[PDB]
Each structure stands twice: as C-alpha cells, then as structure tokens.
Design an enzyme around this catalytic site. Sequence first.
Site, PDB file in Angstrom:
ATOM      1  N   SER B 200       0.834  -1.193   0.000  1.00 50.55           N
ATOM      2  CA  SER B 200       0.000   0.000   0.000  1.00 50.55           C
ATOM      3  C   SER B 200       0.886   1.268   0.000  1.00 50.55           C
ATOM      4  O   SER B 200       1.734   1.389  -0.867  1.00 50.55           O
ATOM      5  CB  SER B 200      -0.995  -0.097   1.148  1.00 50.55           C
ATOM      6  N   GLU B 325      -9.009  -5.413  -3.952  1.00 56.68           N
ATOM      7  CA  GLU B 325      -8.330  -4.216  -3.458  1.00 56.68           C
ATOM      8  C   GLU B 325      -9.254  -3.192  -2.825  1.00 56.68           C
ATOM      9  O   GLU B 325      -8.922  -2.640  -1.786  1.00 56.68           O
ATOM     10  CB  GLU B 325      -7.581  -3.566  -4.607  1.00 56.68           C
ATOM     11  N   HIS B 438      -7.424  -5.682   0.689  1.00 55.48           N
ATOM     12  CA  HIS B 438      -6.173  -4.926   0.713  1.00 55.48           C
ATOM     13  C   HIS B 438      -5.443  -5.181   2.051  1.00 55.48           C
ATOM     14  O   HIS B 438      -5.981  -4.944   3.117  1.00 55.48           O
ATOM     15  CB  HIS B 438      -6.585  -3.456   0.496  1.00 55.48           C
TER      16      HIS B 438
END
Lengths: 536, 531
Positions: B200, B325, B438
Amino acid sequence: EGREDPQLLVRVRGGQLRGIRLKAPGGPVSAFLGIPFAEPPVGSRRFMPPEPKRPWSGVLDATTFQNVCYQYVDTLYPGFEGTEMWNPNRELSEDCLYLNVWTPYPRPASPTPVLIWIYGGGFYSGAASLDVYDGRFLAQVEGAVLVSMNYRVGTFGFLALPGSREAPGNVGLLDQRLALQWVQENIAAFGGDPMSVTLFGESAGAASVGMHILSLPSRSLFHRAVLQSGTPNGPWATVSAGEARRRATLLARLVGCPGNDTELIACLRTRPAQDLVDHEWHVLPQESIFRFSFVPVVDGDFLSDTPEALINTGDFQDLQVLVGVVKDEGSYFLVYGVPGFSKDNESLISRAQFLAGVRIGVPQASDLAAEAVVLHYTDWLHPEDPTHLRDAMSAVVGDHNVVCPVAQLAGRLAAQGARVYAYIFEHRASTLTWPLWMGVPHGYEIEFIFGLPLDPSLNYTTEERIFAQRLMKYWTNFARTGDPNDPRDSKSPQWPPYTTAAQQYVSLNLKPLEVRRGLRAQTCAFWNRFLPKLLS
Amino acid sequence: EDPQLLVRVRGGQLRGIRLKAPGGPVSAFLGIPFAEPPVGSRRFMPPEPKRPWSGVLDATTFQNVCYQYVDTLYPGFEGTEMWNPNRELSEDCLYLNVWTPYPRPASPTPVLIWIYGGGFYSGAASLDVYDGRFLAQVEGAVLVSMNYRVGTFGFLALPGSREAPGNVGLLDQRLALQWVQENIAAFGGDPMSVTLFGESAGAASVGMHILSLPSRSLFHRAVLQSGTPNGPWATVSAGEARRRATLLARLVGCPNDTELIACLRTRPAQDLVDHEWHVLPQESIFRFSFVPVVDGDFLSDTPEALINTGDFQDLQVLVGVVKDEGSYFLVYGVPGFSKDNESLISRAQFLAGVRIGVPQASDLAAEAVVLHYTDWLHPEDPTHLRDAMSAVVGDHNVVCPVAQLAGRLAAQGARVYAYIFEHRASTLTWPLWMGVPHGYEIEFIFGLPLDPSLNYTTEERIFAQRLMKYWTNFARTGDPNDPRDSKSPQWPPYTTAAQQYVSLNLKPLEVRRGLRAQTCAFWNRFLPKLL
Ligand SMILES: Nc1ccc2c(c1)c(-c1ccccc1)[n+](CCCCCCc1cn(CCNc3c4c(nc5ccccc35)CCCC4)nn1)c1cc(N)ccc21
Ligand SMILES: Nc1ccc2c(c1)c(-c1ccccc1)[n+](CCCCCCc1cn(CCNc3c4c(nc5ccccc35)CCCC4)nn1)c1cc(N)ccc21
Ligand SMILES: *[C@@H]1O[C@H](CO)[C@@H](O)[C@H](O)[C@H]1NC(C)=O
Ligand SMILES: *[C@@H]1O[C@H](CO)[C@@H](O)[C@H](O)[C@H]1NC(C)=O
C-alpha cells in the site's frame, strides 16, 4: 375473355387484371405483377405525394414486373454477382409505382394472412422485382398472400424543402402507404385477409416499417410488423428538416438551379432524372459510409417528432413485432469507402487505418467520441493485430448503424407494451460470393426467409433447404398469430419474447434454436447511453 | 551473555534477544535508533543521524509507534485492531528492527527491507503481520524494518520553506536505508544485495525511492505490493499541500511560513491529529490528507512524468495486487456498506458511492464510470452493484495504477514480474463479501501460517512457504523462480507485448495475460482525456 385460365382473371377497384401461373418447386402459384397503384409521378408530379391510380379500361396485363424507380446503379464491382443481384433488373423510369401479388393456385377458399414486403437499399435504391424478393415460395409452401411495392427512392422519393407545397418530403413513404391502402381495399379479391396484414422489410425497408409504426395514418393499414436489420431510430434513417433543406438546395445548386421554394423546385422538375442521380452523392456533409443523401425527414407531419422521441413516449400495447440482425451487419459497407478494405483480399488493416476507418464509419463523432470508440473496440491484449482491427472496424459500423439501434428499439417497444421477438441470424449461405471475412453480411438472410433454397436449380445444400423451411414457418406463424412458435409442435425449442428484464433472443442457424440473453448489452450501453452524453 | 546477541554498529554497542521461531532460534535487534528524535524544533524537519551512545544499548523490544490517528470504527474487532498501534505513541519514533539467523550467517546474506503502509497517516514496523522471524529462520534472510513519520509529522509541507519542506517521512526511510548500507554487514547482511519491499503506502514509498536518485544507490531490487507512486492518492502537488497545511494550521489556531510553522511546533501532537482529517477537499475514500508532495527535490516531477521518461535498465521489480483491493475501503465511508451485513446496495447508492470513490471526477466522468461498471443484463442487481463499487475503488486506486507502472517499467528496460493474490485466509474476520481485502497477502509473505498457534490450515502453511521462497529468490537473484525446481510452470516476466502475470493461490502457478486490460484502458487512457 374466352379461353384463359379462369384463376388468373381478377378485378380490383381500378379495373380488370390478368395474371400469370408460375411454377414453384412444390406446384403452381398465381402472380399479378406490375399492378399500378398510383398515377405516374412524372412531370409536375415529381417530388409530390402520390395520387391514387385512375381506373383503366380493358384487362390490364399483370404478367411481368414493371419499371424500377429511377436510381443510382452500383458499379464498384461490375459483372460480380454479389453486387449485381441488388441492381435494377428492369428499366429505370420515374413511372414506377407498381406493386406485385403472389397467391396460392388455386386462390385460397378462406381469407389468408397477407405479408407486405418493403425492400431496402438505403432509401436511394431497390426494387420489388429482384430475385431475392420472389414471393412464389412463401405463397406456394405456406399459403401466404404476398405483396410487394415499388416506392420512389433518392431525390424522387425523399428530396424535401420542408414547409413547401411542392416538395414536402417523405413522398416515398407515402407511396408505401398508398400501396398499403390499396391492399386494404383490394386484397380480398385475391383471397387475402385485410384484417391480418404483416409488414416486413430489411434495412431501409425495415426502417420504413418502423416509420409506419410511428405514423398514425399508417397504423390502421396493418396489424403486425417485422424489422430485419434496420430501424427508424439511429444515425442514418432520418434527417432533420434543416439538414434536408440544406441537401436539397445544395443539389439544386449542383444542377444549375438557383429565392423561394416554388421557383427552385420548378427548375429541378425540368432536369432529366439522370442529372439528379449523377449529383445525389455529392451533398453528404462528410466522407462516410452507411449514410445516404435523401432519406425520411422529420417534417412534423408523417413523423410528428424524431423517431427517438416517438419510441421513448409511444404507447405500443396492441403491437407485435419481430426484429433482428445478421452476424456481420457492418462488413460489406467497409469496401464501399474505408481505405484498406476490398472483397478481393483479406483486408488485414493497420491501427492507423482503423482510426481513419472510425472517422468515416462514425462521421458525426467528435475527436473525443472517436477516441472513445477506438478505445472500446481495441483488444488491449493484441492492440495491433490486423485481423482483430479488421473485424473491429466491421463491428463498429455494424453496431452503430444496426445492432445497437435494434437493441434500443426492442427495449423501448417491450417496456411500453409491445410483444417483441428478437433474433440474430448467423448462417452464411453456401452460395455467397463475398469473401469469408465478411461473414454473414447485411442482406444475406433475405433469400432464406423468402425460401429461395427450395429451388433446386440454385444449388443450396439440403440442410439450407430445411433451414429455409423453418424460417418461412417462423415468419408466417408470426404473420398469422403474432407468435413465431408452432402451437402443435410442443417439444421444438421455444422462442421466448424479448423483455427488458431477461433480454432474450434466439440464434437462427442450422442448429435448433438457442436462447441467448443480452443483445450486445455492454457495447450497446456504450452507443445508446454513453455516447449521446458525449455530444453535450 | 550470548555473543551472537552483541553487535557493534557505528554508533556503539547493541544487545538483541534470541527469539523462538517454529523451526529454530533467530536473533532480533529491535528498537535501534537511526535518527535523532524529531521533536520540538525538529518537527516537520528532515531527520538528522543518531548521535553515538555509550555502553550497550538494549535492543530487545519494539520502540514507540510514530504519532498517528487510531482507528475506532469497529472497537475491539480483530480485523481493525491488528492494524492499530501496538506500542506507545510518540513523536520520538525513529527506530528500526533487524532479524537475522541464529547463529549469524557465515557469508553475507541478501537483505530485505520492509516499508509498512497505512496511507502515509498510520502504521508501524512492530505489527504482528510484519514479524521478520519466519523469513529469517526459514530462508536465512536478514530482514530490516523501520518506523517513519506519518501524517502531519511526516508529510505536512509548506513547499519552498526551510522549516517544513515536505517528504520528511520519505527521508526517514532513506536514512534507514543509509543506516543499512553502513551497518548491516555487522549482522551478516550484504549491503550489495538490498531488496526493498512494501505494501500500500509502503509500496508507493518503494516506488518513490525508485524515482528519486539519492535513494537509488541504497538498494538493488524492489517489490511493490498493492501500491504505486503514480495514481490518485500517493502524491499531491505543491499547491495542494500548501493549501492543506495552511488549512490545518487555521483549524488549530495558527498563526509567512516561519511564523506559521513555529506556531504549529508549539501544538501538542494530538491536536494536530484531531484536525488531520478535516483538510481533505471532498467527501472521499482512499484519500489521505498528508502524503508525499511533488516538491521538485525528492520528487523532481510528478511520478507520472518520471515513470514515462525514466531509464530503468538495471532494475528488477516484482509487483502485484490482491483479488479485492477496494472492498474494505467501502465501509469507511460509502453509505450502504458495513462489515456486519452483506451490503447489498441499490443503483442510487452505487452512483453516490462512485462520486465518493472517484472524488476528483466530473459529472460526465462519473457517468462514464457508472456506465462502464454496470452489468447491463442485471443493471439493478444489488450483488452486482456491491461488487462493482468495490471494483471501481480497487481499480482506480490500485490495480490500474499498478498495470500502468508495470507497463512503463517493462517498456523502459526493467525486468518486471507481476501477480494477483487470490487466496482468502481461513482466519479472516472480515465478511465473505470483501473477498481478499487490501493487506491480507502480507501475513503469507511474512510466513505467519508457519506458527501453529495461529490456526492456519496445512495447505496455508505450504502456500506461505512457497511465497516466502518466491520473495527471497527474487531478493537473491532478481528472479522469483526457484533455480532448483526444474519443473514448470515458470513465472514469466511481465512485458508490454505478452502482459503475463501469475495467480498466487493454493493451486500451482497459473499464467494469465492482460491485467484487467480493457478496464485499465478505461482508467489510464480514456478518463484522463475527459479533462
Ligand atoms: N458515383 C459515386 C460518387 C460519389 C459517391 C459514391 C458514388 C458512392 C457509392 C455509392 C453507391 C455505390 C458505390 C459507390 N459513395 C458510397 C456510398 C456508401 C454507402 C452505400 C453502401 C451501399 C451500397 N449499396 C448497394 C446496394 N446493395 C446492397 C443491398 C443490401 N446488401 C448488400 C450486401 C452486399 C453488397 C451490396 C448490398 C441489402 C439491402 C439492399 C441493398 N447499398 N449500400 C459515396 C460516399 C460518400 N460519403 C460520398 C460520395 C460517394
Ligand atoms: N474521526 C474522523 C473525522 C473525519 C474523517 C475521518 C475520521 C475518516 C476516518 C479515517 C480513518 C478511520 C475511520 C474514519 N475519514 C475516512 C478516510 C478514508 C480513508 C481511510 C481508509 C482506511 C482506514 N484504514 C485503517 C488502517 N487499516 C488497514 C490497513 C490495511 N489493510 C486493512 C484491511 C482491512 C481493514 C483495515 C486495514 C493495509 C495497509 C495498512 C493499513 N486504512 N485505510 C474521513 C474522510 C473524509 N473525506 C473526510 C473526513 C473523514
Ligand atoms: C487489399 O486491397 C486494397 C485495395 O485494392 C489495398 O488498398 C489493401 O492494401 C489490400 N490489403 C492487403 C493487406 O493486401
Ligand atoms: C448449379 O449447379 C449446376 C450443376 O452442376 C451448375 O452447372 C450450375 O451452373 C449451377 N448454378 C448456379 C446458380 O450456380
């Protein structure tokens, strides 16, 4: 009278007719060909609404096709069956308002469902006398009464100075309407049922059928409708009043005709028909394909508003329609003006040729809109593959002009009360002379619906003959009942109606019917919902 | 006293601790200072190197977490608390951690440096999912992780000023990288083989070190998991950072640049955090208030401009994404979404969700997103609309920026390997509809399933072993393929022609082509033209 086949003498409102007994594969049929339904629209009657034919004396000979309406004759591939089969097969004349009737021999005991064919040809060409529109098979095998009419095309049919008395526009549509009125008054003499009249047509013929659905005075003249590979909505079937005015006055300038409407039209009426035809193609606003110069105009009369407005607000409760498309609607158009395309090679094109093809195939589109088209139709795994670019150029033209307007039409009709049946026709004739890459081109279902494969001299396969029998049965079942399915034949796979909820349609090919969902749904959301918002 | 736990670095002596891993012992040196505490007059300033210390510094526990907002959306819920700080918050937080094999490696070993994510506003190297002991023990890797400043403390910028120049949190990372060059050999690491990896914002951070010349001599390879320096959330312009900085200052009662920053420096840390979230220009998700700024210094141009014109000839990169995601972001602000139900939404809720998930988008552009992601066969089906909302957010923020990065790096001389991670952990506490969210590949790469007390399946243990091998093979050679395994399917490099990537799940590697290719053409080529 005396010594003639008594089954061939018939009286209609304008007088006596003598028809001809024709041979079909399974037996004889009666044909009455070249029946006049209007006064010849010549001289001061050019550009004017048709007047009904004045009665005649004696027995009118109705044994041969009459003149084809004056039109541009295609010479792209001269001598080639693939093009010449669409070209005029009788003399060209402005005196062309005749219709044809096939009926069983002997004529039916009880009133029979009538099918009226309206040919296509981009509103600039066509004739009811072409071989692919031969009504003898439907008449002999299905017991149908089949009617087809010539209507004016090109400038003669569609040149308009809107608001004028002398060129009001849409007169070719009015010819069609007059032939429909003729069937109401006269078809019972032939054993036809005026209370069961199904219009069918392809391409501009289909758009024409759609315009009769959308125009109130035509609505009492028929009960059901079939639109093959064409619609009244979409980018090519109509023009605004302003655009028709602009094209009419440009054409006038090109032939030496100068300021009010009466004087301009009077001068156009002095010009030889062939002069008008020689400049017809020079008035289009861009380099383009699937665009035609003189088409129905949104006049506020025949069409009270745009076809888009009328299908969005129409009440279609009492209406049954059958609609569909062929697998490769766009393919053939590409050789009539996109650089890189030919019938004589594989037409593998470059990316640059694809971007240039899109500007021509989507001539009204801005830069942004054309990049949207390109980006949507590009395969981003093989962005430069010339086979994929070729097929994508065909699909762009097919989807923009036919498949997506048909999906839009079916969706609006269904949502607003119509019984709709939809198809995709995917069988390529074994006898096709166009190259393999064109797949199943625009127009090549027609010979199957009319039943030509039944003629053993034409060299279709046995499977094709059985397939044609199937289609003839779907079309005439639809004419008879509003439903293409056979009631008696339970186990044969059913053809369910198109609805907004399930969006079902069927594949027409050599295999039994298969039901599919969503008529190019994702891509037609691109053309029908997104693109319009990219002209605001 | 255990002499494997005594190390001499440049600044003095350290004592680490011997930790238990499943297969055997490892050495850990936790809480090693690499900078002067950036406190008082050093707030918002570039980090200075840590002054030498006397004696033996105790490096047996994790140090403080950098001051940050603590998530309270689902209090006491494992799924959120596993990302929250697990040590005391302090501005004094510039420490790093090293795990090494016990005994320390005979010959110099490839070094992996982790950079955590958290949107540049949160995170810590001390989280259980970043535990370096498994990679150290099983693969013999030297693993390093660092704390860097986040939020205002790390990224508040008044560009062109001397006292808040921006990107200081990235300079913290860079300083830890310098520390590794000068010191990692004492632990048996090879300073000539340093692989950065991150997820990330940590991945976008790795990307920013690729794009900034002074960072380039401090590492040799890179891994970017579910994050990029390009894309809509990882940078702001100098003008937009200035605007957010001076808005935040107004919100806390402050006051030229010097005066404004001096007043901000007097404010307690928590006062800055309290108003952090109020400076964003729209209602949004996957947007963060204080992030790297295009300063013309650390970043000489936008990341978009730098990836387009960069020469990446001597660079190996591994990149990828997880199957879902965008899923979790939805419960942090899109009406209709919650962890506690199936989040079946209406069409109206979908249109409204798109304005929030694509906050920078005009009316026309948001209509294009809605029209692209609607399934026109089932335009009103709530299951399709929910999954499409997730996809919009995931594609716009992660998948498509990743596909763009991979493409540019490959076209411009880099060796690139790409993946999609599709295994959902058996222990996941988020609901089924979020799929593989995510962040939930990380625990596998770090090898947590090998700890039998954590209750992963056997299959999951073997899967994590495979991933640990891919990642450390990549660190060793620039190639994730086991040079011993002479059976297929090999993981091929990503290229712009073939566009090959692989699925990471419980099944053997499968090669696919085109990373959401049609849809990424939408985001990467069409939408920009809709200016
Ligand atoms: N002499 C000129 C001067 C200028 C232009 C000309 C011709 C043409 C052109 C028109 C017709 C035929 C050949 C050439 N064009 C091209 C017109 C292209 C669009 C018409 C394409 C077309 C051609 N036909 C012939 C009728 N035949 C068919 C059909 C149908 N299907 C098929 C299937 C394959 C082949 C033909 C065919 C079905 C329905 C009925 C007729 N119908 N539609 C121009 C275009 C411009 N934008 C500007 C100027 C000119
Ligand atoms: N108190 C306020 C006031 C105003 C706003 C606030 C909060 C929030 C908000 C921020 C954080 C948490 C809850 C609410 N928001 C929402 C901001 C949306 C961005 C935050 C989304 C988010 C939240 N987290 C928590 C860290 N946790 C994770 C992660 C990662 N993965 C996962 C996976 C599942 C769940 C969490 C998680 C991986 C990397 C690191 C951290 N990461 N990313 C606002 C938005 C506006 N437009 C305006 C004002 C405000
Ligand atoms: C096919 O023929 C056309 C027209 O004659 C030509 O322009 C085109 O380049 C040809 N295509 C190929 C790839 O041979
Ligand atoms: C059909 O086949 C016959 C018999 O061999 C052939 O001689 C004839 O010319 C063909 N006709 C057509 C329409 O192609």
